[PDB]
Amino acid sequence: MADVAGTSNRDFRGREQRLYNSEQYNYNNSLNGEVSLWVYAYYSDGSVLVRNCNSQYKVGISECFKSLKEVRVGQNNDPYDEQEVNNGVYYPNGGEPTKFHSNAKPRAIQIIFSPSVNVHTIKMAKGNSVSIPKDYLQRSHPWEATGVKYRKIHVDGEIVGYSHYFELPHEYNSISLSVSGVHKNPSSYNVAAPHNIMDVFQSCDLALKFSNRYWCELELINHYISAYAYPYLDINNHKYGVPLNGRQ
Amino acid sequence: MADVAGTSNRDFRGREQRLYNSEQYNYNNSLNGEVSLWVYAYYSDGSVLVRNCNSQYKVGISECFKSLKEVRVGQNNDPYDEQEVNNGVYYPNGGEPTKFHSNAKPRAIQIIFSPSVNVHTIKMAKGNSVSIPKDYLQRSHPWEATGVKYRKIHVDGEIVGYSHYFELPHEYNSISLSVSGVHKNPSSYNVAAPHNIMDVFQSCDLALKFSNRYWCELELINHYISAYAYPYLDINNHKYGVPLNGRQ
Amino acid sequence: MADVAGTSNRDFRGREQRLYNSEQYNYNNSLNGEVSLWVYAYYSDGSVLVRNCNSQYKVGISECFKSLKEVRVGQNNDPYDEQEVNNGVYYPNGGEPTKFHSNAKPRAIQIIFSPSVNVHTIKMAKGNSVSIPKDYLQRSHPWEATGVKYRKIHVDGEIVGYSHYFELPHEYNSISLSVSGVHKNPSSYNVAAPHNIMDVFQSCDLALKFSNRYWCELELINHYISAYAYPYLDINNHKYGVPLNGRQ
Ligand SMILES: Nc1nc2c(ncn2[C@@H]2O[C@H](COP(=O)(O)OP(=O)(O)OP(=O)(O)O)[C@@H](O)[C@H]2O)c(=O)[nH]1
Ligand SMILES: Nc1nc2c(ncn2[C@@H]2O[C@H](COP(=O)(O)OP(=O)(O)OP(=O)(O)O)[C@@H](O)[C@H]2O)c(=O)[nH]1
Ligand SMILES: Nc1nc2c(ncn2[C@@H]2O[C@H](COP(=O)(O)OP(=O)(O)OP(=O)(O)O)[C@@H](O)[C@H]2O)c(=O)[nH]1
Ligand SMILES: Nc1ncnc2c1ncn2[C@@H]1O[C@H](COP(=O)(O)OP(=O)(O)OP(=O)(O)O)[C@@H](O)[C@H]1O
Ligand SMILES: Nc1ncnc2c1ncn2[C@@H]1O[C@H](COP(=O)(O)OP(=O)(O)OP(=O)(O)O)[C@@H](O)[C@H]1O
Ligand SMILES: Nc1ncnc2c1ncn2[C@@H]1O[C@H](COP(=O)(O)OP(=O)(O)OP(=O)(O)O)[C@@H](O)[C@H]1O
């Protein structure tokens, strides 16, 4: 005898490796492929809650003020005091917690999409603590289209995902949050027109969700992001992901 | 320069105020606007759980027997005994709780929609304790269309919302509950036909939800309803809401 | 005369009984009828979690690794240790629980549909512990169509439901799970084309859900399955259900 490895056009092992990676990249971008969304809530103790949803055609996550708060499973969370925090955040002077600022409040949110999203379809409702998009329902558009703010996460010249990050450093940064994006579809075949619409309804049923609180960004990077070939952007602006298209 | 306030057609401050209010009322009723649903569960201790959802195009809430039960966050809820209540309510003589009637059972339900709902589209599945609409699945239509029972909440001659209220005073009033309504659309443009269908799918992702148990109706009126310009109807048939159209 | 019972074509009581049963069977199969899905998670202590959803047009259930785990309401569940189990199952050697195998892990899953499902529409995402269908998102089709594996549950010659059962006997059988099916529609009228599409969106709102952990299969058979005329298949391959069509 056979040709020698890495010297000719008959390194079929090499060609197959490149195709395997290209096939995965392009399958993900096909209408048969996943589109995925991660919402990361960063807490002052360094821990990070991730909410993930993976689905065909479109994907979303919807959270309220309470559901974004840090919960340390199987440890003390002062649940009564934190309900009083909630009452005090839903209306000023509306509660009697033993604290001014709950350390269970997120300090920042990172939204990441898989590279298979179309950024023009991204929608976000970053609402107030009682789940209104813009102060009062009567004046609220139920979302903002924020795609232009999404940064490409590049690795080795390939877009491995998209990130929108915003800090919540101020005491009044008390939010509810929903996010939605639609899978790429450069064809003119509408996946939700009658020929395929019921499948999109089924995709709502079939969407897989994951949630966990990791003790720190290092642990998240190591045992979640890297383990499962997900894209990420850390606090030092370091990009993580696996470039696949046309690559060995 | 200038004319004197409140004496001529050049009180532009006055005209702008009236337009600001009219714009909010009419924006809410546009296809860009919210439709909102509140389900209030009233408990014997005077507290009130609210479940709220705010979304474009259509909105709904789905609860089971268990999820409607009173939960006092961070206080004693006798969770084992209340699981035995559940077993005893799912099937007669099916549990061994230390009580005949759980005070965590709702005594009444009020369903309120924003004025932007079309009442003809309202659907409710008030089912039994195991989440069947009408005793057995084989004979169950999955909803009832109850719009004709909805009372207008009028303030200053304007409809600020719609209410359907039913008490659960009897021991056998053990329910599951889902409710759905569609945003007004007097146009013939179908928001869920192919030109806009994927946006309606995204609205399912983007819908914002809120839940809280207020200690009493007074507190709910003060720190939830009134604070956020929501419609309400209290036990004394008093109407709450903010009239906007054509008004200063 | 009157004729004597059970001797002539004028036993109208008999004819009405047969029609009542036939009407229920056939109503369930009409587009006005329910389609229902049950996911049973079997634990080593003999208890069984059921997740049920009942809805018009289509129905689904989506669970993650954590949500399928046994929770004994109001009893000790060692929540910190079980969070460490989760960390250790999401990534090998990723936690520090006091055990090798959590007895809260399901030992098997049974998926049952009502007889009103079309088995060709059934879709399942049996994913890994972090909610990816097939190891990595890039290579994952978001479901498998498993209808050919569904066994008919026959009683008295009638199909009363469909079952797909799989054991999780191995230590590596750590899963996430979503399942979806569409209600029979032998007509060519698309329930999700524009004439009726918004109603299918409302059905997503209106779907009723039920969850409970029964202490054993006997109790489930007695107080859930049999009580509510649901189909079932027990560990000894015994079929349960109520035959209705053309029957008294
Ligand atoms: N492209 C390129 N890579 C370099 C160069 N010098 C060092 N490198 C390293 O080599 C890596 C790329 O190697 P290859 O993947 O085999 O080069 P390629 O350009 O992708 O060529 P093909 O994969 O054969 O199409 C990069 O990640 C660099 O870190 C250089 O001059 N050009
Ligand atoms: N319309 C009306 N309001 C009265 C009358 N007497 C007292 N009021 C009070 O005045 C309020 C309405 O005042 P306005 O809003 O300025 O009157 P309006 O009829 O709405 O007239 P415009 O807003 O200028 O179109 C009501 O809420 C009443 O409580 C009356 O005779 N007619
Ligand atoms: N069909 C049938 N059933 C039998 C026979 N012998 C005993 N059985 C029992 O009788 C039951 C059926 O009785 P029926 O429902 O009145 O008989 P059928 O065949 O359904 O007749 P129709 O309901 O009048 O149309 C079955 O469940 C059997 O357990 C037999 O020879 N033929
Ligand atoms: N020294 C080099 N000279 C020329 N081309 C390079 C070199 N290093 C990498 N490349 C190529 O340039 C392209 C971009 O790779 P690069 O490593 O810059 O991506 P990146 O990970 O986004 O970089 P960075 O994260 O440092 O901004 C790839 O096709 C890669 O093969
Ligand atoms: N004394 C009055 N004489 C004439 N018109 C009035 C008077 N008070 C209010 N109105 C007008 O009548 C219309 C209805 O207002 P009204 O206060 O009756 O509404 P409402 O809040 O539903 O009343 P209620 O709650 O007492 O049934 C409004 O346009 C208002 O400006
Ligand atoms: N002894 C019998 N002789 C003839 N027909 C019978 C007899 N028993 C039942 N049947 C009929 O045969 C058909 C199938 O009934 P059968 O009891 O076999 O269904 P099944 O409950 O699926 O049976 P199994 O569970 O034992 O496999 C029905 O129409 C029934 O009336």
Q: Please write down the HEC assignment for all residues of B109-156.
A: EEEEECCCEEEEEEEEEEECCCCCCCCCHHHCCCCECCHHHCEEEEEC
Q: What's the CA gap between C137 and A24, in Å, rounded? A: 9
Number of residues that make up chain A: 248
Q: What are phi and psi of C191, to 5 degrees?
A: -65, -15
Q: What are phi and psi of C164, to 5 degrees?
A: -125, 125
- Interchain contact, B202 vs A132, CB within 8 Å: no
Task: Enter the resolution in angstroms.
Answer: 1.5
Residues of C contacting chain B (CB within 8 angstroms): 24-25, 27-28, 32-34, 36, 52, 54-56, 73-75, 114, 194, 197-198, 201-212, 223-224, 227-230, 244
B85: enclosing H helix or E strand = helix B79-90
| Nearest alpha carbon, ligand 6 atom 10 | C156
Q: What's the CA gap between A134 and A139, in Å, rounded? A: 7
Q: What's the CA gap between C144 and B174, in Å, rounded? A: 38
SS3 of A198, please?
helix
Contacts of C133 in chain A (CB under 8 A): 34, 54, 208
The answer to whether the beta carbons of residues B190 and C197 sit under 8 Å apart is: yes
Residue type, C173: N
SS3 of C87, please?
helix
Q: What's the CA gap between A17 and A5, in Å, rounded? A: 13
Both tokens assigned to C143: 């479901």
Which residues of C are known binding-site members for ATP? 156-157
Judged by its nearest atom, the ligand closest to the C-alpha of residue A155 is 4
Q: What's the CA gap between B69 and C175, in Å, rounded? A: 31
- Interchain contact, A137 vs B28, CB within 8 Å: yes
Residue type, B234: D
Ligand 2: distance of its center to the CA of B157 in Å?
11
**Cα angle A112, A132, A210; round to 5:** 35
Q: What separation in angstroms does the CA of B101 have from each of A97, B70, B97, B173?
A: 32, 13, 10, 11
CB atoms within 10 A of CB C64: 22
**Of B117, B116, B171, which Cα lies nearest the Cα of B145?**
B117
- Interchain contact, A54 vs C123, CB within 8 Å: no
A86: enclosing H helix or E strand = helix A79-90
Both tokens assigned to A58: 């479109």
Which residues is A151 bridged to in the sheet? Answer: A163
Judged by its nearest atom, the ligand closest to the C-alpha of residue C14 is 3
Q: Taking the alpha carbons of B235, B238, B244, B248 in that order, is the dihedral positive or negative?
A: negative
| Nearest alpha carbon, ligand 4 atom 10 | A156
Residues lining ligand 5, Cβ inside 6 A: B 154-157, 239
Q: What's the CA gap between A154 and A161, in Å, rounded? A: 7
Q: What's the CA gap between B66 and B82, in Å, rounded? A: 9
In the sheet that holds C48-56, the strands lie side by side as C151-155, C158-167, C108-113, C34-42, C48-56, C208-214
Given the CA of residue A154, which atom of ligand 4 is nearest to it? 22
Q: What's the CA gap between C177 and C163, in Å, rounded? A: 16
List Cβ neighbours of B14 (8 Å cut-off, separation of 6 or more): B5, B6, B248
Q: Which residue has the tokens 């109850």?
A: B146
Judged by its nearest atom, the ligand closest to the C-alpha of residue B246 is 2
Both tokens assigned to A151: 């940064």
Range of the domain at C36: 1-248
B209: enclosing H helix or E strand = strand B208-214
Task: For ligand 4, say whether the CB of A123 is within 6 Å of any of its atoms.
Answer: no
Q: What's the CA gap between B221 and B235, in Å, rounded? A: 11
The answer to whether the beta carbons of residues B195 and B206 sit under 8 Å apart is: no
**Of C226, C205, C223, which Cα lies nearest the Cα of C213?**
C223
- Interchain contact, B130 vs C228, CB within 8 Å: yes
List Cβ neighbours of B67 (8 Å cut-off, separation of 6 or more): none
Residue type, B130: V
Q: What's the CA gap between B58 and C201, in Å, rounded? A: 8
The answer to whether the beta carbons of residues A246 and A95 sit under 8 Å apart is: no
Q: How far is C170 from chain B (nearest CA, A)?
A: 31
Q: What are phi and psi of A48, to 5 degrees?
A: -140, 120
Q: What's the CA gap between B207 and B60, in Å, rounded? A: 9
The answer to whether the beta carbons of residues A133 and A125 sit under 8 Å apart is: yes
SS3 of A156, please?
coil
Both tokens assigned to C114: 């009502």
Q: Which residue has the tokens 């460490």?
A: C84
What own/partner pairs with CB < 8 Å and gap ≥ 24 does C212-218 have? C212/B86, C212/B87, C212/B90, C212/C49, C212/C50, C213/C47, C213/C48, C213/C49, C213/C50, C213/C70, C213/C71, C213/C72, C213/C73, C214/C47, C214/C48, C214/C50, C215/C46, C215/C47, C216/C46, C216/C47, C216/C48, C217/C42, C217/C46, C217/C48
Residue in B206, B209, B229 closest to A142 by CB: B206
Q: By CB neighbour count within 10 A (0-12 exposed, 13-18 middle, 19+ buried), where does C85 fall?
A: buried
Q: What's the CA gap between A203 and C143, in Å, rounded? A: 9
Q: What's the CA gap between A87 and A94, in Å, rounded? A: 5
SS3 of B78, please?
coil
Q: What's the CA gap between A33 and C138, in Å, rounded? A: 7
Q: What are phi and psi of C65, to 5 degrees?
A: -55, -45
Q: What separation in angstroms does the CA of B80 have from each of A76, A92, B86?
A: 20, 36, 10
Question: Would you report the helix, strand and coil content of chain C in percent, each value rounded to 5?
Answer: 25, 30, 45
| Nearest alpha carbon, ligand 5 atom 7 | B156
Residue from C130, C174, C205 to probe the interface with A (highest A Cβ count within 10 Å): C130
Please, what is the end-to-end C-alpha distance for chain C in angstroms? 25
Number of residues that make up chain B: 248
Q: What separation in angstroms does the CA of C45 have from each of B107, C71, C105?
A: 36, 12, 11
The answer to whether the beta carbons of residues B125 and B118 sit under 8 Å apart is: no
Q: How far is B209 from chain A (nearest CA, A)?
A: 6
The answer to whether the beta carbons of residues B113 and B162 sit under 8 Å apart is: yes
List Cβ neighbours of C76 (8 Å cut-off, separation of 6 or more): none
| Total domains present in chain B | 1
Ligand 4: distance of its center to the CA of A131 in Å?
43
Which residues is B39 bridged to in the sheet? Answer: B51, B111
C44: DSSP letter: T
Given the CA of residue A243, which atom of ligand 4 is nearest to it? 21
Residue in B194, B202, B211 closest to A58 by CB: B202
Looking from the CA of B237 toward its CB, the CA atoms found within 13 Å total 1
Strands C176-183 and C117-127, bridge-based pairing = antiparallel
Looking from the CA of C184 toward its CB, the CA atoms found within 13 Å total 16
Looking from the CA of C126 toward its CB, the CA atoms found within 13 Å total 16
Q: What's the CA gap between B202 and A123, in Å, rounded? A: 8
B4: DSSP letter: P
Residue in C32, C36, C227 closest to B137 by CB: C36
Q: What's the CA gap between C200 and C198, in Å, rounded? A: 5
**Of C155, C138, C123, which Cα lies nearest the Cα of C244?**
C155
- Interchain contact, B73 vs A79, CB within 8 Å: yes
Contacts of A57 in chain B (CB under 8 A): 201
Contacts of B34 in chain A (CB under 8 A): 133, 137-138, 140, 142
In the sheet that holds B176-183, the strands lie side by side as B58-63, B176-183, B117-127
**Of C72, A245, C58, which Cα lies nearest the Cα of B80?**
C72
Q: What's the CA gap between B103 and B76, in Å, rounded? A: 13
Which residues is B37 bridged to in the sheet? Answer: B53, B113
Contacts of B205 in chain A (CB under 8 A): 58-62, 123, 178-180
Contacts of C71 in chain B (CB under 8 A): none
| Nearest alpha carbon, ligand 4 atom 7 | A156
Residue in A34, A73, A114 closest to C80 by CB: A73
Ligand 5: distance of its center to the CA of B240 in Å?
14
**Of A74, A99, A49, A102, which Cα lies nearest the Cα of A211?**
A49
